[PDB]
Symmetry: D3
Subunit: 251 residues, 6 copies
């Protein structure tokens, strides 16, 4: 029935699309697609929800990755088999630097590889670096909408707790090599934690594919406030506008 | 609001459940729950679909993990915060040993850690070993229903493609350290590949939680046939019967 | 003269034995063999003392390994060349968990690989896991004699000091990566330290051989008492009875 | 006496300079400085030759690093202590990709860390990534002068010979882990080999300093010609023009 | 009771000895001691047989280590607690270089660390280097008795079989990282394989103790002959003469 | 023009020299050469300044290496291609042990490999050990001039700051794995820090070349005094006299 093992998609479903916008949450896919022209639901299998839309007369696919490098690596590989050559990740994120504020935009140049899947594509010495054209388009798009933008390194963790040094957990334990790790990243100028960029960027950079990542800040762990639903929604829309505007320049 | 960050659940949702059956696919959760009494949909957030049911008068939770260690680690942590102390994984898998046949059942004693998330809980030297009571219950459940059972080691990979040495891919490339790795695992008596057990077993064994894993064989890489959809579903149902029967003896 | 390089044994010496009981101390071999029928000294070369005996009419070999993975690996390989397929380690051990008491029995499901020899058989990601049939027989045997039994993970160290974080030593120094390591293992639920299981279990699990391990607790490092010779002898005999009873079910 | 241990410079020597152009060869520093206004020799200590010049009315420093990460790390640290916040490396290089031609220009987004000094600033997981403003300035400068430009990843090696898989050597030997490594990098889209960028980029990105790198192609390993001395000098001058032009936009 | 946990010795047993000759085989200790004055049996516990003797009027101890780093580490620590500051290892070995002949003598300057126990004392970067006074004494002793001597590096392996690339074994398997390793060592000028020097040398060099090692060649892997038992014994005696003569100059 | 890529030397320039004295500083080369007969400047390219001189009627080359393993590895390789088989490093160094005084001489038996270039010749397990004949000649030469000599291990770092745990720096930061590292080395008996020996010794020991290293102590970090220029010059000359005297015995 399907041309790929997981996504439940055919080559025909994409209608010639060579660019994908890849959020983490399957529920965010519809919201992104409906910003563009003629949006249509393609398929929903497991954590992979896909919509097609049109941007300046060209087909674009929006496809969820799920949380983490493993599911991300499946989505990227199978979209590549369906003709996608450019991948733009859109997210919402915390920040770990005092100068980054809620509502700010982060463009990731490269990731600290605290994942496992990146290693299935390149050894650790290989940089988890974003594509220059993608990063440039994201920076320009953020500037065009008047965003407060920070450009730099993101720590990409296979866990959303220990790996991000969270202690309000079931065991309250963080393994030795991750204990004190957040302070290390902070001292090295790392902007934030997320969970997919190390895999996404390493995979694409070693596979002849283009990848970039943008994210809107919803919380800062050095000045931690409970996020407001109104502000989070606005920040999400702000970041989505940027990723779509960047995509217009990468078609 | 929910009591946890990702699962969209409250403590009350579980109604006292301390055991979880944890498949990968959100769309497979309902079918497992309906083997038991009073199956009820709890939540569907991102790749995490959860249903409550009753087994021998005791509340049990069935919750999907999504694909890979990262999302699995989130599901296990948040279920633990909601009172789950026992985790049984059920899946379907491809075998890498000639003596294992399609329709056979695999009980995993421990995993080869080809993931990243396990390292966030214990250093590599720590064994990704299953809980003995869980393993025993699974073995007993398998032999009680007349299964052909293999007990042993599973290779647990952060990728579906290069980490399992698949070459029919976009790039056709497999990185040096994974090239020839399948033959290595075969030579050491490893039964199969899957994508979540290294994280699940390492996390639970180091956090005072009990975990086990069972899987039905749908393909054998050494004598590779295209699986019949009917046979796949039958083997899936067979493995699900075993995981539920095992759960009865762990309550 | 001999069929093997180290053990000083011939195929004929074993009289068809396919199961070995493997203690560490050459002096313990006679005591174990004499619990069974028709015991006879076979050979004593270096740290390798071997006796043959009969269990339910079947020949069984008891052979010392010496201290550590290297000598253990030699004993296992050369016994395998002499037809041994099942190896049961019997020991006396300390414990590092408050709930484990002197006189209790520990059955090891898998080992933390703090050795070097295991790596000569499999990379670190491979689990140092015991054979399920062997572990099952040991657990059943312990239950049959009314033992207080703990089942779980053992830390297996190439040293009996630094690697076990002992400071009352010549230098009083423990290298950085082992400093604070005991607390790490304790927090992860590890039962005890010993010095051979990482090699034994990794080697057997990767070589198509069956291995299990049982040990009697003589000291607890969280509530450390000087052991009494009377109690140590009783605990040794208690554990030996278990390993022989388990062996009866694995012939 | 000097204000620093190796460079033989005082704070006053820089006359307010906060940007450095950092070539490898001490004997190449003068030629770069004389592109700009009022070029003056500052010091020549060991492999560190430094000249001051003025670019658009702002003092700039040109300082050699010597060959390799170790001497580079000294130059960067001591220049930082003297007020330098931006570091632009200029070099000439051999390409390892068929599409890259002699006379082409390479802008490095990030480096494969085949060095040792980068590890003294950040663990291997940290990306050896260039500063985005620096990279942008270099790309813009390259296209402004009509260069044929390639943007991407560079392999940065602690050796000229075995680490770059050269076999026409004294021993003719290349150690196992580097044997076949060039093919690996080529398969991942790595552009070229050089010897300083892993250290330079990792150090700067983790120390709150900005760094970029540009290089002129003098040979291609896949279509290897003996370079013409005239062409080498012309390509060198072309790359130097680009680094200086980029510097104008970073002041 | 004894003053140490394993050796079964008291401080008084050594009668002031501060130098130990440490062979592997317990059954070889007596023969070494009887080269010297008033040889007396001290203890035989597990693989640790110890004899006292007098050399030029000074008490010396000969104590077996057993096979491998783990038991060696125990013997060295406990002898150190009993006042031993100098450790000289004597063994017999197989060479891996064409120019080294049966009956030749090898003095080890340092070891390739293919063991686990050395890591319990120093990280891998630390050299497994012999004490210069010990090495000098051994070299001088060798040339004083008309030996054909080779001075250099020894590969020290935690296994006799796979770690030394032996394939005539039960499984016939050698794990990937050790497959082809012998050729690697040969290419780097490594003289031979043995099983204890990495632990012995690393431990002593990091604990303020002096260590050296000498061995007689009984076989050459590149020109492999079955050793004659007479020749083996003669070469053993020759090496023992050298270790004792060296000891005279270290008192 | 030149027979090698970097040094700017021909085979004829060396006039049959097979021994090189290799200081770090290009400015020190003239001073060393002029201690011998008929000194002549050969070439000066980048950090590589070379002089030829005559010692007991035999040609010897003095050639600078620059700072660090990478430039050292180039100098050693290209000198080897020009017929040099013996390399003697001469330096001035700090010390990290309380018993070592300013003006003392250090002879290095082996290095702690805190570099990157050594790995391009041998894996980490391989010892960075000096040649016995070279070390012997240096020790004898130091004794002949009445030096206070310490013989042992040197920590060889790719950086002159962080890697040597210096905090009076631009960032004041030392990466986690180097934080507290100096105390570790001190506790293990390491004499001093320098920056070239790990590469030099590993490279030579694995390439069939002979290498030794001697250095004069100018500062002690446990009792840190500002060095006097008079004393530093005397110590430099003292060490140079030793390296030349040692060279006389290695021709
Ligand atoms: Na997922
Ligand atoms: Na240099
Ligand atoms: Na032993």
């Amino acid at each position: 029935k399907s041309d790929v093992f997981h996504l439940g998609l055919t080559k025909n479903d994409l209608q010639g699309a060579t660019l994908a916008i890849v959020p983490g949450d399957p529920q965010r896919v519809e919201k992104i697609a409906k910003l563009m022209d003629n949006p249509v639901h393609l398929a929903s299998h497991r954590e992979f929800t896909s919509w097609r839309a049109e941007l300046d007369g060209k087909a674009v696919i929006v496809c969820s990755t799920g949380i983490g490098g493993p599911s991300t690596s499946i989505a990227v590989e199978e979209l590549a088999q369906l003709g996608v050559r450019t991948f733009l990740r859109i997210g919402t994120t915390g920040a770990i630097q005092p100068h980054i504020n809620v509502g700010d935009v982060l463009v990731t140049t490269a990731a600290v590889r605290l994942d496992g899947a990146s290693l299935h594509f390149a050894p650790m010495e290989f940089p988890a670096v974003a594509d220059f054209s993608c990063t440039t388009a994201l920076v320009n798009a953020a500037k065009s909408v008047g965003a407060t933008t920070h450009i730099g390194i993101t720590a990409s963790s296979d866990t959303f707790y220990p790996g991000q040094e969270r202690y309000d957990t079931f065991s309250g334990r963080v393994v030795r090599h991750f204990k004190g790790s957040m302070e290390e990243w902070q001292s090295m100028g790392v902007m934030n934690y997320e969970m997919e960029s190390a895999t996404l960027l390493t995979m694409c950079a070693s596979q002849g594919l283009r990848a970039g990542m943008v994210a809107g800040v919803i919380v800062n762990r050095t000045q931690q406030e409970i996020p407001n639903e109104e502000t989070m929604k606005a920040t999400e829309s702000h970041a989505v506008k940027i990723v779509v505007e960047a995509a217009r320049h990468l078609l």
